Structures are given as C-alpha cells and as structure tokens.
Amino acid sequence: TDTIVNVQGSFFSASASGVADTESLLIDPQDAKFGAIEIHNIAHGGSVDVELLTSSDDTELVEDAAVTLDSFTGEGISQGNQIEASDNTNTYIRITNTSGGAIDIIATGREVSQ
Amino acid sequence: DLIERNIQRVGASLENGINRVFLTELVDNAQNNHDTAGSNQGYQALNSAV
Ligand SMILES: [Mg+2]
Ligand SMILES: [Mg+2]
C-alpha cells in the first residue's frame, strides 16, 4: 500500500576540453561519491579509442590489465552503454584521442554502490 | 419462551430492514466520491473523503 517516488541515483560525468592528439581522459571511479560508475554516454569531438584498465595500485593507475573496448570515428555520441568501473576493483576507463588534432570529450552516466 | 424468541426475531428482522433502507440510501445518494483506484485505501482514503 505504501507509495514511494523513485528518483535515479547520482549523476556522474568526466570531461576535457582540447585534449591533445595522443592524450586521454582518465575516468576514475575515485571521483564518484559511491565509489563505482556506470558510463552510459561518450560524446567525442573526433576519433577515439576506449580502453578499460585495472590498476596494480589502490589509488593510482599502474597498469595490470588493459583491454581496448572499441574505436569510435568522427564526431558523435555513443549512448546506452554499461561501461562499468569501481575504485575497490581498481578499474579505470581511458578515452584516447586519435584525431589529427585536439578534441573535446564528455562522458556521462551514474554512480553505483561500491 | 417461543413467543419471546419470536418477538425478538420480529424486532431484529425489522431493525435489519431499517438498516438496509438506511445503508442503501447512504451509499446510493452521497454527492461526493473518493475514487481510491485500488491504492492509498485506509486512512488516506478516509481523510480524502473528509
Ligand atoms: Mg582503488
Ligand atoms: Mg463535491
């Protein structure tokens, strides 16, 4: 009988303006308050490689495992993803620019409990 | 005492009749309505009706 209104759990975003020709956006779950993130959207101003990394260290990225998830080309939106990372699993998401110049990158999603 | 029993039955039977007439009127002719729509029935339905 009891009726509750459901609002979705905390928004998460990582962004960079003018990330250089081989530089990257390091999406780090440490920046989320619940400690884990689920990236739905990656808006990219040019071609990018997406890479999922596990660190050998609890709080800095020192690469243990690395897998390139996909390559996106042109300017556009990838949406409806469930790219998943958390601090306690030491998981980082990297978006690397592969354009012949600087681009803008905006990743968005929501927090998940650690 | 069967006459007392039957006096009791006749009394109760009429009182039941009064109650039928009363309830039927009360339910049929109320100008206000609170449509619960299968939800918040109980106190919230009573309070909403008030
Ligand atoms: Mg960690
Ligand atoms: Mg009215």
mmCIF file with all atom_site columns, C-alpha atoms and ligand atoms in Angstrom:
data_model
loop_
_atom_site.group_PDB
_atom_site.id
_atom_site.type_symbol
_atom_site.label_atom_id
_atom_site.label_alt_id
_atom_site.label_comp_id
_atom_site.label_asym_id
_atom_site.label_entity_id
_atom_site.label_seq_id
_atom_site.pdbx_PDB_ins_code
_atom_site.Cartn_x
_atom_site.Cartn_y
_atom_site.Cartn_z
_atom_site.occupancy
_atom_site.B_iso_or_equiv
_atom_site.pdbx_formal_charge
_atom_site.auth_seq_id
_atom_site.auth_comp_id
_atom_site.auth_asym_id
_atom_site.auth_atom_id
_atom_site.pdbx_PDB_model_num
ATOM   1   C  CA . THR A 1 1   ? 0.000   0.000   0.000   1.00 0.00 ? 1   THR A CA 1
ATOM   2   C  CA . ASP A 1 2   ? 2.810   2.457   0.948   1.00 0.00 ? 2   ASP A CA 1
ATOM   3   C  CA . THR A 1 3   ? 3.706   4.540   -2.173  1.00 0.00 ? 3   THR A CA 1
ATOM   4   C  CA . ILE A 1 4   ? 7.234   5.933   -2.806  1.00 0.00 ? 4   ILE A CA 1
ATOM   5   C  CA . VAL A 1 5   ? 8.530   8.273   -5.548  1.00 0.00 ? 5   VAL A CA 1
ATOM   6   C  CA . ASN A 1 6   ? 11.761  6.905   -7.109  1.00 0.00 ? 6   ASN A CA 1
ATOM   7   C  CA . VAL A 1 7   ? 14.472  9.342   -8.270  1.00 0.00 ? 7   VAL A CA 1
ATOM   8   C  CA . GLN A 1 8   ? 17.527  7.886   -10.059 1.00 0.00 ? 8   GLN A CA 1
ATOM   9   C  CA . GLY A 1 9   ? 20.875  7.702   -8.230  1.00 0.00 ? 9   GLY A CA 1
ATOM   10  C  CA . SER A 1 10  ? 23.644  10.246  -8.539  1.00 0.00 ? 10  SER A CA 1
ATOM   11  C  CA . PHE A 1 11  ? 24.696  11.606  -11.912 1.00 0.00 ? 11  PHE A CA 1
ATOM   12  C  CA . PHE A 1 12  ? 28.366  11.182  -12.865 1.00 0.00 ? 12  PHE A CA 1
ATOM   13  C  CA . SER A 1 13  ? 30.433  12.989  -15.527 1.00 0.00 ? 13  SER A CA 1
ATOM   14  C  CA . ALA A 1 14  ? 34.029  13.336  -16.676 1.00 0.00 ? 14  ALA A CA 1
ATOM   15  C  CA . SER A 1 15  ? 35.064  15.894  -19.296 1.00 0.00 ? 15  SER A CA 1
ATOM   16  C  CA . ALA A 1 16  ? 38.039  17.524  -21.010 1.00 0.00 ? 16  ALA A CA 1
ATOM   17  C  CA . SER A 1 17  ? 38.344  20.405  -23.483 1.00 0.00 ? 17  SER A CA 1
ATOM   18  C  CA . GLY A 1 18  ? 41.150  20.405  -26.060 1.00 0.00 ? 18  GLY A CA 1
ATOM   19  C  CA . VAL A 1 19  ? 42.700  17.013  -25.202 1.00 0.00 ? 19  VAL A CA 1
ATOM   20  C  CA . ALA A 1 20  ? 45.779  16.685  -27.479 1.00 0.00 ? 20  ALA A CA 1
ATOM   21  C  CA . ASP A 1 21  ? 46.485  14.322  -30.428 1.00 0.00 ? 21  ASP A CA 1
ATOM   22  C  CA . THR A 1 22  ? 47.552  11.284  -28.325 1.00 0.00 ? 22  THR A CA 1
ATOM   23  C  CA . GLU A 1 23  ? 46.416  12.370  -24.822 1.00 0.00 ? 23  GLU A CA 1
ATOM   24  C  CA . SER A 1 24  ? 43.476  10.902  -22.879 1.00 0.00 ? 24  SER A CA 1
ATOM   25  C  CA . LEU A 1 25  ? 40.554  11.424  -20.491 1.00 0.00 ? 25  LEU A CA 1
ATOM   26  C  CA . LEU A 1 26  ? 41.186  9.196   -17.455 1.00 0.00 ? 26  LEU A CA 1
ATOM   27  C  CA . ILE A 1 27  ? 37.751  8.423   -15.998 1.00 0.00 ? 27  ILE A CA 1
ATOM   28  C  CA . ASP A 1 28  ? 38.433  7.461   -12.378 1.00 0.00 ? 28  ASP A CA 1
ATOM   29  C  CA . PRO A 1 29  ? 35.746  5.999   -10.020 1.00 0.00 ? 29  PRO A CA 1
ATOM   30  C  CA . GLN A 1 30  ? 37.552  7.660   -7.074  1.00 0.00 ? 30  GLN A CA 1
ATOM   31  C  CA . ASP A 1 31  ? 35.772  10.887  -8.172  1.00 0.00 ? 31  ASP A CA 1
ATOM   32  C  CA . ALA A 1 32  ? 32.320  9.316   -7.552  1.00 0.00 ? 32  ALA A CA 1
ATOM   33  C  CA . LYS A 1 33  ? 30.872  9.501   -4.001  1.00 0.00 ? 33  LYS A CA 1
ATOM   34  C  CA . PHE A 1 34  ? 29.521  5.915   -4.092  1.00 0.00 ? 34  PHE A CA 1
ATOM   35  C  CA . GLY A 1 35  ? 32.886  4.722   -5.469  1.00 0.00 ? 35  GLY A CA 1
ATOM   36  C  CA . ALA A 1 36  ? 31.602  2.949   -8.632  1.00 0.00 ? 36  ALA A CA 1
ATOM   37  C  CA . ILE A 1 37  ? 30.491  4.332   -12.024 1.00 0.00 ? 37  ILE A CA 1
ATOM   38  C  CA . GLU A 1 38  ? 28.451  3.124   -15.000 1.00 0.00 ? 38  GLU A CA 1
ATOM   39  C  CA . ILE A 1 39  ? 29.198  5.200   -18.122 1.00 0.00 ? 39  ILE A CA 1
ATOM   40  C  CA . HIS A 1 40  ? 26.202  5.367   -20.460 1.00 0.00 ? 40  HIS A CA 1
ATOM   41  C  CA . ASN A 1 41  ? 27.350  8.166   -22.788 1.00 0.00 ? 41  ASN A CA 1
ATOM   42  C  CA . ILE A 1 42  ? 30.618  9.080   -24.510 1.00 0.00 ? 42  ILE A CA 1
ATOM   43  C  CA . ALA A 1 43  ? 30.427  12.260  -26.591 1.00 0.00 ? 43  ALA A CA 1
ATOM   44  C  CA . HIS A 1 44  ? 33.615  12.644  -28.667 1.00 0.00 ? 44  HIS A CA 1
ATOM   45  C  CA . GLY A 1 45  ? 34.713  15.619  -30.827 1.00 0.00 ? 45  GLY A CA 1
ATOM   46  C  CA . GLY A 1 46  ? 36.761  13.327  -33.124 1.00 0.00 ? 46  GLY A CA 1
ATOM   47  C  CA . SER A 1 47  ? 38.084  9.745   -33.348 1.00 0.00 ? 47  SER A CA 1
ATOM   48  C  CA . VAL A 1 48  ? 38.866  7.965   -30.033 1.00 0.00 ? 48  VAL A CA 1
ATOM   49  C  CA . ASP A 1 49  ? 39.952  4.601   -28.609 1.00 0.00 ? 49  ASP A CA 1
ATOM   50  C  CA . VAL A 1 50  ? 38.195  3.413   -25.431 1.00 0.00 ? 50  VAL A CA 1
ATOM   51  C  CA . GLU A 1 51  ? 40.327  1.321   -23.047 1.00 0.00 ? 51  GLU A CA 1
ATOM   52  C  CA . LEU A 1 52  ? 39.388  -0.429  -19.783 1.00 0.00 ? 52  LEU A CA 1
ATOM   53  C  CA . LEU A 1 53  ? 42.239  -0.758  -17.284 1.00 0.00 ? 53  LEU A CA 1
ATOM   54  C  CA . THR A 1 54  ? 42.807  -2.464  -13.930 1.00 0.00 ? 54  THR A CA 1
ATOM   55  C  CA . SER A 1 55  ? 45.477  -0.935  -11.674 1.00 0.00 ? 55  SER A CA 1
ATOM   56  C  CA . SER A 1 56  ? 48.000  -2.858  -9.576  1.00 0.00 ? 56  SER A CA 1
ATOM   57  C  CA . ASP A 1 57  ? 47.675  0.000   -7.009  1.00 0.00 ? 57  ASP A CA 1
ATOM   58  C  CA . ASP A 1 58  ? 44.634  1.006   -4.917  1.00 0.00 ? 58  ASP A CA 1
ATOM   59  C  CA . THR A 1 59  ? 44.590  4.775   -5.660  1.00 0.00 ? 59  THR A CA 1
ATOM   60  C  CA . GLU A 1 60  ? 46.880  5.452   -8.690  1.00 0.00 ? 60  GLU A CA 1
ATOM   61  C  CA . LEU A 1 61  ? 46.803  3.848   -12.169 1.00 0.00 ? 61  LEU A CA 1
ATOM   62  C  CA . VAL A 1 62  ? 49.734  1.442   -12.626 1.00 0.00 ? 62  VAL A CA 1
ATOM   63  C  CA . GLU A 1 63  ? 48.501  -0.835  -15.443 1.00 0.00 ? 63  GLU A CA 1
ATOM   64  C  CA . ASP A 1 64  ? 47.905  -4.511  -14.523 1.00 0.00 ? 64  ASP A CA 1
ATOM   65  C  CA . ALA A 1 65  ? 45.337  -5.329  -17.247 1.00 0.00 ? 65  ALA A CA 1
ATOM   66  C  CA . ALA A 1 66  ? 44.326  -3.285  -20.324 1.00 0.00 ? 66  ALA A CA 1
ATOM   67  C  CA . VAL A 1 67  ? 41.664  -4.049  -22.974 1.00 0.00 ? 67  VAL A CA 1
ATOM   68  C  CA . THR A 1 68  ? 40.668  -1.755  -25.868 1.00 0.00 ? 68  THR A CA 1
ATOM   69  C  CA . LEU A 1 69  ? 36.856  -1.845  -25.799 1.00 0.00 ? 69  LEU A CA 1
ATOM   70  C  CA . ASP A 1 70  ? 36.139  -0.110  -29.137 1.00 0.00 ? 70  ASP A CA 1
ATOM   71  C  CA . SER A 1 71  ? 37.274  2.549   -31.636 1.00 0.00 ? 71  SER A CA 1
ATOM   72  C  CA . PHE A 1 72  ? 34.864  5.416   -32.392 1.00 0.00 ? 72  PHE A CA 1
ATOM   73  C  CA . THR A 1 73  ? 35.430  7.538   -35.537 1.00 0.00 ? 73  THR A CA 1
ATOM   74  C  CA . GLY A 1 74  ? 34.171  11.022  -36.460 1.00 0.00 ? 74  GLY A CA 1
ATOM   75  C  CA . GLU A 1 75  ? 32.305  13.394  -34.111 1.00 0.00 ? 75  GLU A CA 1
ATOM   76  C  CA . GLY A 1 76  ? 29.265  11.957  -32.312 1.00 0.00 ? 76  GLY A CA 1
ATOM   77  C  CA . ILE A 1 77  ? 27.582  10.116  -29.430 1.00 0.00 ? 77  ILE A CA 1
ATOM   78  C  CA . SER A 1 78  ? 27.904  6.573   -28.164 1.00 0.00 ? 78  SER A CA 1
ATOM   79  C  CA . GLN A 1 79  ? 24.955  6.016   -25.774 1.00 0.00 ? 79  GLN A CA 1
ATOM   80  C  CA . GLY A 1 80  ? 23.178  3.215   -23.881 1.00 0.00 ? 80  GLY A CA 1
ATOM   81  C  CA . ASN A 1 81  ? 26.484  1.609   -22.803 1.00 0.00 ? 81  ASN A CA 1
ATOM   82  C  CA . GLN A 1 82  ? 27.086  -0.030  -19.424 1.00 0.00 ? 82  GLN A CA 1
ATOM   83  C  CA . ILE A 1 83  ? 30.872  0.512   -19.226 1.00 0.00 ? 83  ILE A CA 1
ATOM   84  C  CA . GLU A 1 84  ? 31.471  -0.329  -15.562 1.00 0.00 ? 84  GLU A CA 1
ATOM   85  C  CA . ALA A 1 85  ? 34.312  0.646   -13.203 1.00 0.00 ? 85  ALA A CA 1
ATOM   86  C  CA . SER A 1 86  ? 34.936  0.918   -9.439  1.00 0.00 ? 86  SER A CA 1
ATOM   87  C  CA . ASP A 1 87  ? 37.667  2.076   -7.061  1.00 0.00 ? 87  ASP A CA 1
ATOM   88  C  CA . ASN A 1 88  ? 37.789  -1.136  -4.977  1.00 0.00 ? 88  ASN A CA 1
ATOM   89  C  CA . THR A 1 89  ? 38.163  -3.280  -8.123  1.00 0.00 ? 89  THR A CA 1
ATOM   90  C  CA . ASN A 1 90  ? 40.876  -0.736  -9.142  1.00 0.00 ? 90  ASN A CA 1
ATOM   91  C  CA . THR A 1 91  ? 39.168  -0.172  -12.518 1.00 0.00 ? 91  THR A CA 1
ATOM   92  C  CA . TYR A 1 92  ? 39.826  2.915   -14.696 1.00 0.00 ? 92  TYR A CA 1
ATOM   93  C  CA . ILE A 1 93  ? 38.316  3.888   -18.085 1.00 0.00 ? 93  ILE A CA 1
ATOM   94  C  CA . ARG A 1 94  ? 40.612  5.707   -20.546 1.00 0.00 ? 94  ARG A CA 1
ATOM   95  C  CA . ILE A 1 95  ? 39.443  7.565   -23.665 1.00 0.00 ? 95  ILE A CA 1
ATOM   96  C  CA . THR A 1 96  ? 42.422  8.262   -26.009 1.00 0.00 ? 96  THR A CA 1
ATOM   97  C  CA . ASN A 1 97  ? 42.269  10.879  -28.808 1.00 0.00 ? 97  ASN A CA 1
ATOM   98  C  CA . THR A 1 98  ? 43.294  9.534   -32.270 1.00 0.00 ? 98  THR A CA 1
ATOM   99  C  CA . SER A 1 99  ? 42.340  12.633  -34.348 1.00 0.00 ? 99  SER A CA 1
ATOM   100 C  CA . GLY A 1 100 ? 44.972  14.731  -36.163 1.00 0.00 ? 100 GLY A CA 1
ATOM   101 C  CA . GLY A 1 101 ? 44.437  17.473  -33.556 1.00 0.00 ? 101 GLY A CA 1
ATOM   102 C  CA . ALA A 1 102 ? 42.776  18.468  -30.258 1.00 0.00 ? 102 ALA A CA 1
ATOM   103 C  CA . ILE A 1 103 ? 39.201  17.339  -29.387 1.00 0.00 ? 103 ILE A CA 1
ATOM   104 C  CA . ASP A 1 104 ? 36.540  17.718  -26.658 1.00 0.00 ? 104 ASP A CA 1
ATOM   105 C  CA . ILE A 1 105 ? 35.294  14.637  -24.712 1.00 0.00 ? 105 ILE A CA 1
ATOM   106 C  CA . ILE A 1 106 ? 32.263  14.355  -22.368 1.00 0.00 ? 106 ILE A CA 1
ATOM   107 C  CA . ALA A 1 107 ? 31.457  11.066  -20.620 1.00 0.00 ? 107 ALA A CA 1
ATOM   108 C  CA . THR A 1 108 ? 28.260  10.758  -18.550 1.00 0.00 ? 108 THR A CA 1
ATOM   109 C  CA . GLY A 1 109 ? 26.436  8.110   -16.563 1.00 0.00 ? 109 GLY A CA 1
ATOM   110 C  CA . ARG A 1 110 ? 25.553  7.324   -12.969 1.00 0.00 ? 110 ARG A CA 1
ATOM   111 C  CA . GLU A 1 111 ? 27.096  6.098   -9.727  1.00 0.00 ? 111 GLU A CA 1
ATOM   112 C  CA . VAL A 1 112 ? 26.623  2.529   -8.434  1.00 0.00 ? 112 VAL A CA 1
ATOM   113 C  CA . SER A 1 113 ? 27.328  1.379   -4.851  1.00 0.00 ? 113 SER A CA 1
ATOM   114 C  CA . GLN A 1 114 ? 30.867  0.065   -4.347  1.00 0.00 ? 114 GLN A CA 1
ATOM   115 C  CA . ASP B 2 1   ? -40.209 -18.886 25.683  1.00 0.00 ? 1   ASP B CA 1
ATOM   116 C  CA . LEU B 2 2   ? -41.014 -19.163 21.935  1.00 0.00 ? 2   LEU B CA 1
ATOM   117 C  CA . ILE B 2 3   ? -43.233 -16.068 21.924  1.00 0.00 ? 3   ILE B CA 1
ATOM   118 C  CA . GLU B 2 4   ? -40.343 -14.068 23.437  1.00 0.00 ? 4   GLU B CA 1
ATOM   119 C  CA . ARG B 2 5   ? -37.933 -15.706 20.890  1.00 0.00 ? 5   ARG B CA 1
ATOM   120 C  CA . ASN B 2 6   ? -40.288 -14.774 18.021  1.00 0.00 ? 6   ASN B CA 1
ATOM   121 C  CA . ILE B 2 7   ? -40.836 -11.243 19.394  1.00 0.00 ? 7   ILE B CA 1
ATOM   122 C  CA . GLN B 2 8   ? -37.017 -10.982 19.364  1.00 0.00 ? 8   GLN B CA 1
ATOM   123 C  CA . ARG B 2 9   ? -36.860 -12.302 15.747  1.00 0.00 ? 9   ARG B CA 1
ATOM   124 C  CA . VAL B 2 10  ? -39.615 -9.885  14.571  1.00 0.00 ? 10  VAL B CA 1
ATOM   125 C  CA . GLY B 2 11  ? -37.815 -6.950  16.297  1.00 0.00 ? 11  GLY B CA 1
ATOM   126 C  CA . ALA B 2 12  ? -34.370 -7.864  14.879  1.00 0.00 ? 12  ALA B CA 1
ATOM   127 C  CA . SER B 2 13  ? -35.852 -8.533  11.384  1.00 0.00 ? 13  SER B CA 1
ATOM   128 C  CA . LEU B 2 14  ? -37.409 -5.018  11.311  1.00 0.00 ? 14  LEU B CA 1
ATOM   129 C  CA . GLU B 2 15  ? -34.204 -3.386  12.663  1.00 0.00 ? 15  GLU B CA 1
ATOM   130 C  CA . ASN B 2 16  ? -32.305 -5.187  9.844   1.00 0.00 ? 16  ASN B CA 1
ATOM   131 C  CA . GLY B 2 17  ? -34.870 -3.715  7.390   1.00 0.00 ? 17  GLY B CA 1
ATOM   132 C  CA . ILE B 2 18  ? -34.297 -0.171  8.813   1.00 0.00 ? 18  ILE B CA 1
ATOM   133 C  CA . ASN B 2 19  ? -30.535 -0.725  8.379   1.00 0.00 ? 19  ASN B CA 1
ATOM   134 C  CA . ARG B 2 20  ? -30.950 -1.908  4.753   1.00 0.00 ? 20  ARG B CA 1
ATOM   135 C  CA . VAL B 2 21  ? -33.073 1.177   3.879   1.00 0.00 ? 21  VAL B CA 1
ATOM   136 C  CA . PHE B 2 22  ? -30.548 3.440   5.666   1.00 0.00 ? 22  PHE B CA 1
ATOM   137 C  CA . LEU B 2 23  ? -27.394 1.919   4.114   1.00 0.00 ? 23  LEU B CA 1
ATOM   138 C  CA . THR B 2 24  ? -28.896 1.745   0.600   1.00 0.00 ? 24  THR B CA 1
ATOM   139 C  CA . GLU B 2 25  ? -29.821 5.458   0.768   1.00 0.00 ? 25  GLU B CA 1
ATOM   140 C  CA . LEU B 2 26  ? -26.487 6.440   2.352   1.00 0.00 ? 26  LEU B CA 1
ATOM   141 C  CA . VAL B 2 27  ? -24.437 4.630   -0.337  1.00 0.00 ? 27  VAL B CA 1
ATOM   142 C  CA . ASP B 2 28  ? -26.677 5.463   -3.353  1.00 0.00 ? 28  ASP B CA 1
ATOM   143 C  CA . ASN B 2 29  ? -27.237 9.215   -2.782  1.00 0.00 ? 29  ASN B CA 1
ATOM   144 C  CA . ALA B 2 30  ? -23.875 10.598  -1.474  1.00 0.00 ? 30  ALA B CA 1
ATOM   145 C  CA . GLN B 2 31  ? -22.974 13.555  -3.745  1.00 0.00 ? 31  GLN B CA 1
ATOM   146 C  CA . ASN B 2 32  ? -19.236 13.189  -3.092  1.00 0.00 ? 32  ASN B CA 1
ATOM   147 C  CA . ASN B 2 33  ? -16.929 10.327  -4.031  1.00 0.00 ? 33  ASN B CA 1
ATOM   148 C  CA . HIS B 2 34  ? -13.296 9.480   -3.381  1.00 0.00 ? 34  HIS B CA 1
ATOM   149 C  CA . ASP B 2 35  ? -12.023 7.168   -6.126  1.00 0.00 ? 35  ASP B CA 1
ATOM   150 C  CA . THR B 2 36  ? -9.162  5.279   -4.432  1.00 0.00 ? 36  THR B CA 1
ATOM   151 C  CA . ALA B 2 37  ? -8.185  3.481   -7.691  1.00 0.00 ? 37  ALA B CA 1
ATOM   152 C  CA . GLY B 2 38  ? -7.073  0.349   -5.730  1.00 0.00 ? 38  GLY B CA 1
ATOM   153 C  CA . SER B 2 39  ? -4.418  2.399   -3.829  1.00 0.00 ? 39  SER B CA 1
ATOM   154 C  CA . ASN B 2 40  ? -3.968  4.501   -0.605  1.00 0.00 ? 40  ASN B CA 1
ATOM   155 C  CA . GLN B 2 41  ? -7.079  2.831   0.850   1.00 0.00 ? 41  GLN B CA 1
ATOM   156 C  CA . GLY B 2 42  ? -7.336  3.214   4.655   1.00 0.00 ? 42  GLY B CA 1
ATOM   157 C  CA . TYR B 2 43  ? -6.504  6.476   6.460   1.00 0.00 ? 43  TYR B CA 1
ATOM   158 C  CA . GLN B 2 44  ? -5.625  8.406   3.265   1.00 0.00 ? 44  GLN B CA 1
ATOM   159 C  CA . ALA B 2 45  ? -8.940  7.368   1.647   1.00 0.00 ? 45  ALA B CA 1
ATOM   160 C  CA . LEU B 2 46  ? -10.870 8.362   4.836   1.00 0.00 ? 46  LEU B CA 1
ATOM   161 C  CA . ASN B 2 47  ? -9.010  11.701  5.092   1.00 0.00 ? 47  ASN B CA 1
ATOM   162 C  CA . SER B 2 48  ? -9.540  12.360  1.339   1.00 0.00 ? 48  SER B CA 1
ATOM   163 C  CA . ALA B 2 49  ? -13.285 11.596  1.730   1.00 0.00 ? 49  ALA B CA 1
ATOM   164 C  CA . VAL B 2 50  ? -13.446 14.059  4.699   1.00 0.00 ? 50  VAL B CA 1
HETATM 165 MG MG . MG  C 3 .   ? 41.117  1.624   -5.992  1.00 0.00 ? 1   MG  C MG 1
HETATM 166 MG MG . MG  C 3 .   ? -18.112 17.887  -4.387  1.00 0.00 ? 2   MG  C MG 1
#
